[PDB]
Design an enzyme around this catalytic site. Structure first.
Site, PDB file in Angstrom:
ATOM      1  N   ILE B 154       0.826  -1.190   0.000  1.00 42.52           N
ATOM      2  CA  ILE B 154       0.000   0.000   0.000  1.00 42.52           C
ATOM      3  C   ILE B 154       0.867   1.249   0.000  1.00 42.52           C
ATOM      4  N   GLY B 156       4.455   3.727   0.484  1.00 39.69           N
ATOM      5  CA  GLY B 156       5.751   4.197   0.261  1.00 39.69           C
ATOM      6  C   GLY B 156       6.137   4.120  -1.214  1.00 39.69           C
ATOM      7  N   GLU B 321     -20.130  29.548 -31.006  1.00 42.20           N
ATOM      8  CA  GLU B 321     -21.261  29.097 -31.771  1.00 42.20           C
ATOM      9  C   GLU B 321     -22.542  29.096 -30.930  1.00 42.20           C
ATOM     10  N   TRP B 343     -18.879  27.632 -39.678  1.00 46.89           N
ATOM     11  CA  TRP B 343     -19.983  27.833 -40.634  1.00 46.89           C
ATOM     12  C   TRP B 343     -19.510  28.445 -41.941  1.00 46.89           C
ATOM     13  N   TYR B 369     -30.465  27.497 -36.654  1.00 44.57           N
ATOM     14  CA  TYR B 369     -30.643  27.180 -35.221  1.00 44.57           C
ATOM     15  C   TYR B 369     -31.118  28.393 -34.408  1.00 44.57           C
ATOM     16  N   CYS B 429     -28.914  19.325 -37.929  1.00 43.54           N
ATOM     17  CA  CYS B 429     -28.661  17.944 -37.494  1.00 43.54           C
ATOM     18  C   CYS B 429     -29.147  17.746 -36.068  1.00 43.54           C
ATOM     19  N   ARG B 449     -30.338  13.762 -35.923  1.00 44.61           N
ATOM     20  CA  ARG B 449     -30.820  12.962 -37.034  1.00 44.61           C
ATOM     21  C   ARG B 449     -29.637  12.418 -37.851  1.00 44.61           C
ATOM     22  N   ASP B 452     -22.007  12.429 -37.595  1.00 48.50           N
ATOM     23  CA  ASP B 452     -20.652  12.117 -38.094  1.00 48.50           C
ATOM     24  C   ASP B 452     -19.803  11.776 -36.869  1.00 48.50           C
TER      25      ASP B 452
HETATM   26  N1  LIG Z   1      -0.744   8.220  -2.751  1.00 50.00           N
HETATM   27  C1  LIG Z   1      -0.420   6.954  -2.402  1.00 50.00           C
HETATM   28  O1  LIG Z   1      -0.917   6.018  -3.055  1.00 50.00           O
HETATM   29  C2  LIG Z   1       0.557   6.706  -1.182  1.00 50.00           C
HETATM   30  C3  LIG Z   1       0.736   5.450  -0.580  1.00 50.00           C
HETATM   31  C4  LIG Z   1       1.615   5.299   0.533  1.00 50.00           C
HETATM   32  C5  LIG Z   1       2.334   6.388   1.051  1.00 50.00           C
HETATM   33  N2  LIG Z   1       2.165   7.582   0.474  1.00 50.00           N
HETATM   34  C6  LIG Z   1       2.924   8.758   0.921  1.00 50.00           C
HETATM   35  O2  LIG Z   1       4.295   8.558   0.536  1.00 50.00           O
HETATM   36  C7  LIG Z   1       5.142   9.096   1.552  1.00 50.00           C
HETATM   37  C8  LIG Z   1       5.909   7.898   2.122  1.00 50.00           C
HETATM   38  O3  LIG Z   1       6.749   7.354   1.086  1.00 50.00           O
HETATM   39  P1  LIG Z   1       8.326   7.087   1.232  1.00 50.00           P
HETATM   40  O4  LIG Z   1       8.910   6.260   0.081  1.00 50.00           O
HETATM   41  O5  LIG Z   1       8.993   8.361   1.715  1.00 50.00           O
HETATM   42  O6  LIG Z   1       8.269   6.136   2.518  1.00 50.00           O
HETATM   43  P2  LIG Z   1       7.882   4.574   2.534  1.00 50.00           P
HETATM   44  O7  LIG Z   1       8.221   3.933   1.238  1.00 50.00           O
HETATM   45  O8  LIG Z   1       6.611   4.374   3.330  1.00 50.00           O
HETATM   46  O9  LIG Z   1       9.005   4.259   3.689  1.00 50.00           O
HETATM   47  C9  LIG Z   1      10.209   3.568   3.373  1.00 50.00           C
HETATM   48  C10 LIG Z   1      10.865   3.165   4.680  1.00 50.00           C
HETATM   49  O10 LIG Z   1      10.360   1.865   4.926  1.00 50.00           O
HETATM   50  C11 LIG Z   1      11.462   0.997   5.194  1.00 50.00           C
HETATM   51  N3  LIG Z   1      11.756   0.115   4.049  1.00 50.00           N
HETATM   52  C12 LIG Z   1      11.504   0.294   2.745  1.00 50.00           C
HETATM   53  N4  LIG Z   1      11.935  -0.789   2.047  1.00 50.00           N
HETATM   54  C13 LIG Z   1      12.472  -1.659   2.901  1.00 50.00           C
HETATM   55  C14 LIG Z   1      13.132  -2.979   2.827  1.00 50.00           C
HETATM   56  N5  LIG Z   1      13.300  -3.646   1.672  1.00 50.00           N
HETATM   57  N6  LIG Z   1      13.541  -3.516   3.984  1.00 50.00           N
HETATM   58  C15 LIG Z   1      13.394  -2.877   5.169  1.00 50.00           C
HETATM   59  N7  LIG Z   1      12.825  -1.665   5.307  1.00 50.00           N
HETATM   60  C16 LIG Z   1      12.357  -1.037   4.220  1.00 50.00           C
HETATM   61  C17 LIG Z   1      12.635   1.862   5.556  1.00 50.00           C
HETATM   62  O11 LIG Z   1      12.389   2.127   6.937  1.00 50.00           O
HETATM   63  P3  LIG Z   1      13.476   2.645   8.011  1.00 50.00           P
HETATM   64  O12 LIG Z   1      13.865   4.032   7.575  1.00 50.00           O
HETATM   65  O13 LIG Z   1      12.747   2.688   9.332  1.00 50.00           O
HETATM   66  O14 LIG Z   1      14.545   1.576   7.746  1.00 50.00           O
HETATM   67  C18 LIG Z   1      12.402   3.067   4.673  1.00 50.00           C
HETATM   68  O15 LIG Z   1      13.078   4.243   5.164  1.00 50.00           O
HETATM   69  C19 LIG Z   1       4.226   9.868   2.506  1.00 50.00           C
HETATM   70  O16 LIG Z   1       3.934  11.227   2.059  1.00 50.00           O
HETATM   71  C20 LIG Z   1       2.967   9.062   2.402  1.00 50.00           C
HETATM   72  O17 LIG Z   1       1.835   9.825   2.809  1.00 50.00           O
HETATM   73  C21 LIG Z   1       1.324   7.744  -0.595  1.00 50.00           C
HETATM   74  C1  LIG Z   2      -7.038   4.075   5.841  1.00 57.09           C
HETATM   75  C2  LIG Z   2      -6.540   5.074   6.865  1.00 57.09           C
HETATM   76  C3  LIG Z   2      -7.564   6.171   7.031  1.00 57.09           C
HETATM   77  N1  LIG Z   2      -8.810   5.964   7.552  1.00 57.09           N
HETATM   78  C4  LIG Z   2      -9.717   6.985   7.730  1.00 57.09           C
HETATM   79  N2  LIG Z   2     -10.927   6.675   8.285  1.00 57.09           N
HETATM   80  N3  LIG Z   2      -9.471   8.265   7.361  1.00 57.09           N
HETATM   81  C5  LIG Z   2      -8.271   8.565   6.798  1.00 57.09           C
HETATM   82  N4  LIG Z   2      -8.017   9.841   6.411  1.00 57.09           N
HETATM   83  C6  LIG Z   2      -7.221   7.526   6.590  1.00 57.09           C
HETATM   84  C7  LIG Z   2      -5.874   7.799   5.985  1.00 57.09           C
HETATM   85  C8  LIG Z   2      -5.646   7.397   4.657  1.00 57.09           C
HETATM   86  C9  LIG Z   2      -4.424   7.658   4.084  1.00 57.09           C
HETATM   87  C10 LIG Z   2      -3.406   8.314   4.835  1.00 57.09           C
HETATM   88  O1  LIG Z   2      -2.169   8.487   4.193  1.00 57.09           O
HETATM   89  C11 LIG Z   2      -1.129   9.334   4.577  1.00 57.09           C
HETATM   90  C12 LIG Z   2      -0.072   8.362   5.044  1.00 57.09           C
HETATM   91  C13 LIG Z   2       0.551   7.380   4.039  1.00 57.09           C
HETATM   92  O2  LIG Z   2      -0.147   6.096   4.101  1.00 57.09           O
HETATM   93  C14 LIG Z   2      -0.937   5.784   2.986  1.00 57.09           C
HETATM   94  C15 LIG Z   2      -0.918   6.528   1.805  1.00 57.09           C
HETATM   95  C16 LIG Z   2      -1.693   6.211   0.716  1.00 57.09           C
HETATM   96  C17 LIG Z   2      -2.540   5.142   0.774  1.00 57.09           C
HETATM   97  C18 LIG Z   2      -3.378   4.843  -0.415  1.00 57.09           C
HETATM   98  C19 LIG Z   2      -3.060   3.760  -1.379  1.00 57.09           C
HETATM   99  N5  LIG Z   2      -1.983   2.993  -1.231  1.00 57.09           N
HETATM  100  N6  LIG Z   2      -3.890   3.527  -2.457  1.00 57.09           N
HETATM  101  C20 LIG Z   2      -4.984   4.308  -2.673  1.00 57.09           C
HETATM  102  N7  LIG Z   2      -5.766   4.040  -3.730  1.00 57.09           N
HETATM  103  N8  LIG Z   2      -5.353   5.288  -1.838  1.00 57.09           N
HETATM  104  C21 LIG Z   2      -4.631   5.612  -0.706  1.00 57.09           C
HETATM  105  C22 LIG Z   2      -5.070   6.735   0.195  1.00 57.09           C
HETATM  106  C23 LIG Z   2      -6.381   6.405   0.764  1.00 57.09           C
HETATM  107  C24 LIG Z   2      -2.620   4.416   1.962  1.00 57.09           C
HETATM  108  C25 LIG Z   2      -1.796   4.726   3.053  1.00 57.09           C
HETATM  109  C26 LIG Z   2      -3.630   8.698   6.171  1.00 57.09           C
HETATM  110  C27 LIG Z   2      -4.874   8.435   6.734  1.00 57.09           C
HETATM  111  O1  LIG Z   3     -23.360  19.530 -35.749  1.00 56.88           O
HETATM  112  C1  LIG Z   3     -23.175  18.698 -36.685  1.00 56.88           C
HETATM  113  C2  LIG Z   3     -23.303  19.148 -37.981  1.00 56.88           C
HETATM  114  C3  LIG Z   3     -23.141  18.217 -38.994  1.00 56.88           C
HETATM  115  N1  LIG Z   3     -22.842  16.924 -38.711  1.00 56.88           N
HETATM  116  C4  LIG Z   3     -22.622  15.966 -39.791  1.00 56.88           C
HETATM  117  C5  LIG Z   3     -23.683  14.891 -39.932  1.00 56.88           C
HETATM  118  C6  LIG Z   3     -23.499  14.555 -41.441  1.00 56.88           C
HETATM  119  O2  LIG Z   3     -22.282  13.868 -41.750  1.00 56.88           O
HETATM  120  C7  LIG Z   3     -23.321  15.950 -42.059  1.00 56.88           C
HETATM  121  C8  LIG Z   3     -24.651  16.609 -42.475  1.00 56.88           C
HETATM  122  O3  LIG Z   3     -25.158  16.000 -43.667  1.00 56.88           O
HETATM  123  P1  LIG Z   3     -26.692  15.719 -43.913  1.00 56.88           P
HETATM  124  O4  LIG Z   3     -27.016  14.717 -42.892  1.00 56.88           O
HETATM  125  O5  LIG Z   3     -27.266  17.120 -43.784  1.00 56.88           O
HETATM  126  O6  LIG Z   3     -26.714  15.084 -45.287  1.00 56.88           O
HETATM  127  O7  LIG Z   3     -22.592  16.658 -41.035  1.00 56.88           O
HETATM  128  C9  LIG Z   3     -22.693  16.546 -37.356  1.00 56.88           C
HETATM  129  O8  LIG Z   3     -22.410  15.382 -37.054  1.00 56.88           O
HETATM  130  N2  LIG Z   3     -22.873  17.429 -36.426  1.00 56.88           N
END
Ligand SMILES: NC(=O)c1ccc[n+]([C@@H]2O[C@H](COP(=O)([O-])OP(=O)(O)OC[C@H]3O[C@@H](n4cnc5c(N)ncnc54)[C@H](OP(=O)(O)O)[C@@H]3O)[C@@H](O)[C@H]2O)c1
Ligand SMILES: CCc1nc(N)nc(N)c1-c1ccc(OCCCOc2ccc(-c3c(N)nc(N)nc3CC)cc2)cc1
Ligand SMILES: O=c1ccn([C@H]2C[C@H](O)[C@@H](COP(=O)(O)O)O2)c(=O)[nH]1
Ligand SMILES: NC(=O)c1ccc[n+]([C@@H]2O[C@H](COP(=O)([O-])OP(=O)(O)OC[C@H]3O[C@@H](n4cnc5c(N)ncnc54)[C@H](OP(=O)(O)O)[C@@H]3O)[C@@H](O)[C@H]2O)c1
Ligand SMILES: CCc1nc(N)nc(N)c1-c1ccc(OCCCOc2ccc(-c3c(N)nc(N)nc3CC)cc2)cc1
Ligand SMILES: O=c1ccn([C@H]2C[C@H](O)[C@@H](COP(=O)(O)O)O2)c(=O)[nH]1
Lengths: 542, 547
Positions: B154, B156, B321, B343, B369, B429, B449, B452
């Protein structure tokens, strides 16, 4: 724990039953039901001789096999103890078939004779002396499914015997003389769960229905749930309308009959409609923008889930084509569709104080034949005044069929206020391809209970009329609904109506001597083979 | 050909990316691609702060389990490890920094198994029911020991980066947030040989931005029911009309997509349908067309502005238009002086003469029109006349009706004046508009009617969507659906190759339209009262490749 024989050995019935010659009290108030279609045979042959599409359906259903599902079926059948289906028939039936097409291709043929014995049938056909002997024979065989196909009493011997799992039943919608009925299927034992598209083969309509035994890629599947994450755990009129109301409608699996395009829109407005007041004061459930399509080459889409009458609707259309505005012409033929719109009181309430009773103003007919001419009264002479849209579209179709301007418009904005009321059927567009005519009609306002069923028939008949006088064949009628509504007073009648199962549609015949659109008369139209359910008074009151 | 780790242990990625601040120098015209959407974070939080709907989606995907499928998944995972055989949950895996930006009230994430990658912290540093791991290999070990449905990475960016580098992601569930925010953390550039988009959601609005959800897939670098369906399909034959002139690989991408729910597909599928099943026909034009008859599209203006994205479109012309229509003008010079030429061809001496309008001044288009909208039934004279209070002012009538009789089924605007057709430079049209009001919201059906598809329809959608907005605003309603009905729907032959190209581009989240909220009369709008925001699009396609 418990499981039935038919389900284990997968035992099915496949038939085709036509309508049967009769003689009745006097009037043709002939009630229709499922037993309407029971005609199996006549003197050794089919009551209709030949049907290329039922033949294609029979050969398709009784030779289709799915190997990769056999494993499960074998396992099942053994748990008490090339792949081909089994077909089963009586003796009469086996001797009804020519030696040309015997034994039945890609099928394990199995006859029932109490008479002649196994050792003279020279192919690899089986024989059995009783119906409980089949069961044991399916033990010793590798087969997909087993299909009973054969004569009255062979089928008869299964109302009580309950060995049939589903009836595959072709409805042939035409009346022939018949030597042999089919058994009366008991509604309590076998129930319809599927209905097909309606077709035309060999000068009749037919459809295919399925009765079922009553009991009284993996990955991308989760992605669907994900994409439906923003639904509601409910509907809208779950506060108004109940589930069990549509038990037979909901029970169906395959609803392919074209009448479902109308019924489903009712369903959609009932389940999802918006609750609105309107001009009337009865309220509605409304939605906005739907489309239906009917295939006129294959059927005439006259609703079959209630009784519809078409004399009135045809006279009205004949009255539009003549260009008439005179309500009286229709009233003297007991066509009363426009009566209430021509009364002193109604015209007064429209501010038409200087309009004679039943003078409906420059409505459909006047616009089709005289668009833009100045209206006076229903008796004036309008010959050669205004634009004869009707004539213009017939000339376009004949001379410039690929034109995109073939429209017939009744919504004359200049004239709306002079009309008893403004038109619902706004306009008609035509499309011609490969000798075929298709028609779109846009309807701004659609009473789904009362009006729409007639509206479909009306423009279908008209599409036929226009096609015959242009030397073309009818293709599609396409109906666009703007403000689509179910009046609240219609809701109960329409619940009843959604739970009825469509019959195959009728055909329309036009007198083929008519080559000019002005030349039709009521007698030139014939609705044939209209099988229909009982009439429904849409306002059930008084 | 055997099993990869991500397949066995069902390891997925899910993110949200926004667009990122920049500046352009060679051209103001921004180039756009998938990598347009790459902003993940900013100063430890999400760039957009909060998005309810993306949140809700996040929650749905990462907490959804199907118990029925676990038995099989056990087998799969047991068979790979070479081993035999309380409510089931998913795993989520996050970097330490992401863990540390989640508020305590939300921690650990509910109804999910939480796993945190950290070197610098260990289980003692956490009070929470969570698993700590300090390298990627140890997640695999853990997943082998746990009971779980699916595993979602999800984020990072560091986490997404190393998981995509090791091919350990089976699919990416990627949310395109279609707005721009200040960002300091970025999602890695995906590799289109490694990952392909297979699905695109509907487009939505939440928290003043549109967004959609797409899925990338890793590229390879009671059941007696089915049988009745085969029976009912016994008469549909196997080939398609022009399939022998229209080749499978020309739609490779289009047809590779599994779910095409983005509303732009309503347009793209109609094209596809005409190419495959359309009737080959001559026309007025001489070019000939593929055509069909009768379609309907629906667009939800509360959720987006449906400006097509699979090619570039500008709207200054069609907006001028529309304003010209509203003023009731028939003078083509008024547009040409704004360097709008829609036109122009229709107004030449030659064109008018070939319509037999020998007594019409150049660029006097006749009672078209705007004249019909404001003066239907009036006698047309010339384009300079004063027609004030002549004919039916339909435009004013429908506004009055929407305000004072909203449940009317007669709110129609009609341009097809049968009497005046031949006096028009060409017949209309877009024939009619019908309106519908429910619950403080306005929908519009427009019937066209002649359509295109290559060239006009995209502009037509746009036009009537703006006009639904204009009308809704001056009647104090919210725009809801624009519903578009096509009659004669056609693809000109010269346009095919260009539409084959377009049908294999993948739509972007749509933009939004905003109107000056101070305009309260339909006549008071001017070009600068309109803004298209966040238009992301593929490159221009000139439809005549002969141009
Ligand atoms: N829009 C979205 O879909 C979405 C989703 C998720 C997060 N976000 C956002 O993205 C930002 C976070 O992203 P980010 O890349 O900076 O952080 P991130 O990917 O959540 O954090 C990476 C950290 O996780 C650990 N990590 C990563 N890969 C690892 C591995 N192979 N083994 C062990 N540890 C590993 C390390 O932790 P340590 O430093 O503790 O070693 C690393 O510093 C935030 O702004 C968050 O809100 C957005
Ligand atoms: C599910 C947690 C949650 N629950 C509720 N109830 N309200 C919120 N605002 C939130 C919340 C959602 C995202 C959030 O993100 C900032 C921290 C980074 O962690 C993330 C970031 C992005 C995503 C993520 C993802 N991986 N994929 C999608 N489509 N959408 C989202 C955002 C909803 C999930 C966790 C913080 C709080
Ligand atoms: O707003 C418009 C004006 C014209 N036409 C197209 C439809 C037809 O290809 C042609 C008009 O030809 P007649 O149907 O009038 O023969 O122009 C449209 O799709 N949208
Ligand atoms: N439309 C359809 O679906 C359909 C289907 C099949 C046939 N047909 C037509 O219908 C006509 C024939 O009708 P039908 O009812 O007379 O046909 P049938 O069923 O072929 O003939 C009855 C015969 O089947 C055998 N039989 C019946 N019950 C039996 C039992 N319990 N045990 C053993 N044998 C049994 C008997 O043969 P023995 O005389 O040897 O004892 C009996 O005389 C033909 O014209 C044919 O073309 C129509
Ligand atoms: C196709 C007719 C049909 N449809 C349906 N739906 N169910 C049935 N049981 C039947 C059916 C009825 C009677 C029947 O008994 C044998 C005598 C009936 O008359 C026929 C039927 C078909 C043919 C025939 C033919 N004309 N051409 C071919 N290729 N194959 C066949 C054999 C099915 C010849 C005579 C067999 C099948
Ligand atoms: O051929 C017709 C004529 C009328 N109506 C219905 C639609 C409305 O319920 C009513 C007309 O009322 P307004 O839409 O004009 O208000 O009649 C039809 O369905 N079909």
């Amino acid at each position: 724990m418990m499981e039935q024989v038919c389900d284990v050995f997968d035992i099915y019935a496949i038939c085709a039953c036509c309508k049967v010659e009769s003689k009745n009290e006097g009037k043709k108030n002939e009630v229709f039901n499922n037993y309407t279609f029971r005609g199996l045979g006549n003197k050794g042959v089919l009551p209709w001789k030949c049907n290329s599409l039922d033949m294609k359906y029979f050969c398709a259903v009784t030779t289709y096999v799915n190997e990769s599902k056999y494993e499960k079926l074998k396992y099942k059948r053994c748990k008490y103890l090339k792949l081909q289906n089994v077909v089963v028939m009586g003796r009469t039936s086996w001797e009804s078939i020519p030696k040309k097409f015997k034994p039945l291709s890609n099928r394990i043929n199995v006859i029932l004779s109490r008479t002649l014995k196994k050792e003279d049938f020279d192919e690899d056909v089986y024989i059995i002396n009783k119906v409980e002997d089949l069961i044991v024979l399916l033990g010793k065989l590798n087969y997909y499914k087993c299909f009973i196909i054969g004569g009255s009493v062979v089928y008869q011997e299964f109302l009580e015997k309950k060995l049939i799992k589903k009836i595959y039943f072709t409805r042939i919608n035409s009346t022939y003389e018949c030597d042999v009925f089919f058994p009366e299927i008991n509604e309590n034992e076998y129930q319809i769960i599927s209905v097909s598209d309606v077709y035309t083969s060999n000068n009749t309509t037919l459809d295919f229905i399925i009765y079922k035994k009553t009991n009284n890629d993996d990955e991308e599947e989760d992605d669907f749930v994900y994409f439906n994450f923003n639904k509601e755990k409910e509907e809208k009129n779950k506060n108004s309308i109940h589930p069990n109301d549509f038990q037979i409608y909901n029970s169906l699996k395959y609803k392919y009959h074209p009448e479902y395009q109308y019924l489903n829109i009712i369903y959609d407005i009932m389940m999802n409609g918006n609750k609105q007041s309107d001009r009337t004061g009865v309220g509605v459930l409304s939605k906005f923008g739907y489309i239906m399509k009917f295939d006129l080459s294959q059927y005439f889409p006259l609703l079959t889930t209630k009784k519809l009458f078409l004399r009135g609707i045809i006279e009205e259309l004949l009255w539009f084509i003549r260009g008439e505005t005179n309500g009286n012409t229709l009233l003297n033929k007991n066509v009363r569709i426009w009566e209430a719109n021509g009364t002193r009181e109604f015209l007064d309430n429209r501010k038409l104080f200087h309009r004679e009773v039943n003078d409906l103003g420059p409505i459909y007919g006047f616009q089709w034949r005289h668009f833009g001419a100045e209206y006076t009264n229903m008796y004036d002479n309008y010959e050669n005044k205004g634009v004869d849209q009707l004539k213009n579209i017939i000339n376009l179709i004949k001379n410039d069929p690929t034109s995109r301007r073939i429209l017939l418009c009744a919504w004359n904005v200049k004239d709306l206020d002079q009309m008893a009321l403004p038109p619902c059927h706004i306009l008609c567009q035509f499309y011609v391809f490969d000798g075929k005519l298709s028609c779109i009609m846009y309807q701004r306002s659609c009473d789904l209970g009362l009006g729409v069923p007639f509206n479909i028939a009306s423009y279908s008949i008209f599409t036929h009329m226009i096609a015959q006088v242009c030397n073309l064949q009818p293709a599609q009628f396409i109906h666009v609904l703007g403000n689509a509504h179910v009046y609240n007073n219609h809701i109960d009648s329409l619940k009843i109506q959604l739970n009825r199962i469509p019959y195959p549609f009728p055909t329309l015949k036009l007198n083929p001597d008519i080559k000019n659109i002005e030349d039709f008369t009521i007698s030139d139209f014939t609705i044939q083979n209209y099988v229909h359910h009982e009439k429904i008074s849409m306002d059930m009151a008084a």
